[PDB]
Design a protein around this motif. Structure first.
Motif, PDB file in Angstrom:
ATOM      1  N   UNK B 165       1.114  -0.592   0.194  1.00 46.00           N
ATOM      2  CA  UNK B 165       0.132   0.394   0.282  1.00 46.00           C
ATOM      3  C   UNK B 165       0.913   1.265  -0.095  1.00 46.00           C
ATOM      4  N   UNK B 166       0.735   2.466  -0.972  1.00 49.06           N
ATOM      5  CA  UNK B 166       1.688   3.549  -1.432  1.00 49.06           C
ATOM      6  C   UNK B 166       1.668   4.751  -0.170  1.00 49.06           C
ATOM      7  N   UNK B 167       3.038   4.742   0.437  1.00 46.68           N
ATOM      8  CA  UNK B 167       2.295   5.865   1.654  1.00 46.68           C
ATOM      9  C   UNK B 167       2.685   6.875   1.126  1.00 46.68           C
ATOM     10  N   UNK B 168       4.422   6.954   1.000  1.00 50.72           N
ATOM     11  CA  UNK B 168       4.781   8.379   0.356  1.00 50.72           C
ATOM     12  C   UNK B 168       5.821   8.233  -0.684  1.00 50.72           C
ATOM     13  N   UNK B 174      11.806   7.607  -6.189  1.00 46.84           N
ATOM     14  CA  UNK B 174      11.341   6.746  -5.626  1.00 46.84           C
ATOM     15  C   UNK B 174       9.995   6.305  -4.391  1.00 46.84           C
ATOM     16  N   UNK B 175      10.212   5.710  -4.410  1.00 46.31           N
ATOM     17  CA  UNK B 175       8.409   5.187  -3.863  1.00 46.31           C
ATOM     18  C   UNK B 175       8.313   4.184  -1.984  1.00 46.31           C
ATOM     19  N   UNK B 176       8.427   4.215  -1.330  1.00 49.44           N
ATOM     20  CA  UNK B 176       8.028   2.594  -0.780  1.00 49.44           C
ATOM     21  C   UNK B 176       6.417   3.263   0.159  1.00 49.44           C
ATOM     22  N   UNK B 180       0.741  -5.235   4.354  1.00 50.87           N
ATOM     23  CA  UNK B 180      -0.439  -5.186   4.567  1.00 50.87           C
ATOM     24  C   UNK B 180      -0.739  -6.321   5.938  1.00 50.87           C
ATOM     25  N   UNK B 181      -0.418  -6.113   6.710  1.00 51.97           N
ATOM     26  CA  UNK B 181       0.166  -6.332   8.277  1.00 51.97           C
ATOM     27  C   UNK B 181       0.133  -5.526  10.050  1.00 51.97           C
ATOM     28  N   UNK B 182       0.340  -3.957   8.715  1.00 54.07           N
ATOM     29  CA  UNK B 182       0.741  -3.051   9.296  1.00 54.07           C
ATOM     30  C   UNK B 182       1.923  -2.517   9.590  1.00 54.07           C
ATOM     31  N   UNK B 183       3.070  -3.621   8.949  1.00 55.98           N
ATOM     32  CA  UNK B 183       4.260  -3.420   8.634  1.00 55.98           C
ATOM     33  C   UNK B 183       5.130  -1.937   7.786  1.00 55.98           C
ATOM     34  N   UNK B 184       5.446  -1.250   7.650  1.00 62.47           N
ATOM     35  CA  UNK B 184       6.413  -0.656   5.925  1.00 62.47           C
ATOM     36  C   UNK B 184       7.078  -1.494   5.353  1.00 62.47           C
ATOM     37  N   UNK B 185       7.930  -1.157   4.332  1.00 64.24           N
ATOM     38  CA  UNK B 185       8.598  -1.880   3.371  1.00 64.24           C
ATOM     39  C   UNK B 185      10.146  -0.830   4.182  1.00 64.24           C
TER      40      UNK B 185
END
Lengths: 300, 301
Positions: B165-168, B174-176, B180-185
């Protein structure tokens, strides 16, 4: 920011895919209202995959010779109720009207225009990608056996513009289909035989657009006051394998925002054609012509 | 043949996109069964990007602080009846269930593996494109402001594997995002503070696959008798910003059809980092690692 190739969301088109099957020959069909378009080489057996009298194959065929099945859902079986030939396509008329028929149109593309492809196998969509229609009138895609009939399209508002139905492979990784009027893009024949394709020019406008994209989003360096009048450039293009640059409002918009004139670029492209160095610029390492001016604005 | 970049069909996932709104902040949410997932920074105003403690912001929220509209045939308005926060995502519960909910899972992707992104803007699908999860835990995609909430997925048979899920945007192009467990990439935090890197490395197993596809399209010359053990390579890989080639994926298979030994390519890749000759390989003079072994298989199997 960031610059990737994008196809359109395929939902609406996905709902129109079906599998046409003439005996042991089977491929992909587009179902709109109660017409199913598909390529005409489906009615060609194997022995005569050479010089077939299609008009004979047309009158040979009868409605019971065909079958078509919606795998999407809900399926499934549609009764073939009438058939005709329209150029390299075959126009099957069917029992039921697709309840998922979008607002659609049939339009042809020019070299350097882009459209999205829905790649299907046995009436089942598997992948999508965007392609540009080439100068030699081929597309570079990835299609496998049984992919024939798979379609190409663009979306103008809510209306889905259908511009392509895949026909066959020629060369290696190089493809063609016809438009929905029946005409094969660039004359090719719906039969695999010696029909070697014209050489590939670089889409000059699309490069220029691509280079403007790079001026945004980063650098932007080769930009120097050295320039080449679109008229002297188009003369150079004749010898060096580029298309005749025309340009548009969409291109001017890119000039104005960046503040870099069109020519300052047309010059540059002449220097990176030779200097395949930089090292790179975005992608790439040198010269992408797949990104249209329409695209580059759309991604700001 | 050719070897183009393929996102999966978007159909299934397009059916599940909606718009979420809180305050006057508005982004894209994913609607599955009676559940709507969206990035947790929606409930931030704008003044709290520095120290938004969401612990605080989640209490101050009532169900009646969020509007959620579908927009796509058939429209539209859905009513929140159960909020929650799980990592950097927001887990909403709504009065009605998505009648077009596909078969699905949440699965955290690894570096070098690829997936299809559906770009959305105000709950409206707009483009799709495939992308690879990099080594540095970023994706080099294309978004704009509003697309946050956009989702990345990988179709496994008859099942959708939601992996992004795209956040910022790391102010780079480039993007992170989150899984879908809450965890950031990557271990990033969803905030306007300036954030770090973790340089990129070339995905070895992906370059290898690409080189096979080159051979499959008749491009060879970089091939030689030479070799370089897997472990040899892996030792070298460390030093030169390449990933450990575990590879060892049931492909091979590309090694079997080409009759070119995986190690041979490990040697060739080593010299091609040095080189090129310069010839070109599928229209490139730099190693391409955005194509997986599976891509090369699917695309010519």
């Amino acid at each position: 920011s960031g610059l990737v190739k994008m196809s359109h969301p395929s939902g609406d088109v996905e709902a129109c895919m079906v599998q046409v099957t003439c005996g042991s020959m089977t491929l992909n069909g587009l179902w709109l209202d109660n017409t199913v378009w598909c390529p005409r080489h489906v009615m060609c057996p194997a022995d005569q995959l050479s010089d077939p009298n299609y008009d004979a194959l047309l009158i040979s065929m009868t409605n019971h010779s065909f079958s078509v099945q919606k795998h999407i859902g809900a399926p499934a079986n549609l009764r073939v109720v009438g058939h005709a030939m329209q150029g390299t396509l075959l126009k099957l008329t069917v029992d039921v009207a697709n309840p998922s028929t979008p607002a659609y149109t049939f339009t042809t593309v020019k070299p350097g225009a882009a459209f999205s492809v829905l790649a299907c196998y046995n009436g089942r969509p598997t992948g999508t990608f965007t392609v540009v229609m080439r100068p030699n009138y081929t597309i570079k895609g990835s299609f496998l056996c049984g992919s024939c009939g798979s379609v190409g399209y663009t979306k103008e508002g809510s209306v889905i513009n259908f511009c392509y139905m895949h026909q066959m492979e020629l060369a290696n990784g190089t493809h063609t289909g016809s438009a929905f009027d029946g005409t094969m893009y660039g004359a090719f024949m719906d039969k695999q035989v010696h029909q070697v394709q014209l050489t590939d020019k670089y889409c000059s406008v699309n490069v220029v657009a691509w280079l403007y994209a790079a001026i945004l989003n980063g650098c932007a360096w080769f930009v120097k006051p050295n320039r080449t009048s679109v008229v002297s450039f188009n003369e150079w293009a004749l010898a060096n394998q580029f298309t005749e640059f025309v340009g548009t409002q969409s291109v001017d918009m890119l000039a104005v925002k960046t503040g870099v004139a069109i020519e300052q670029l047309l010059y540059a492209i002449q220097q990176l054609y030779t200097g395949f160095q930089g090292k790179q610029i975005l992608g790439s390492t040198m010269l992408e012509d797949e990104f249209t001016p329409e695209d580059v604005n759309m991604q700001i």
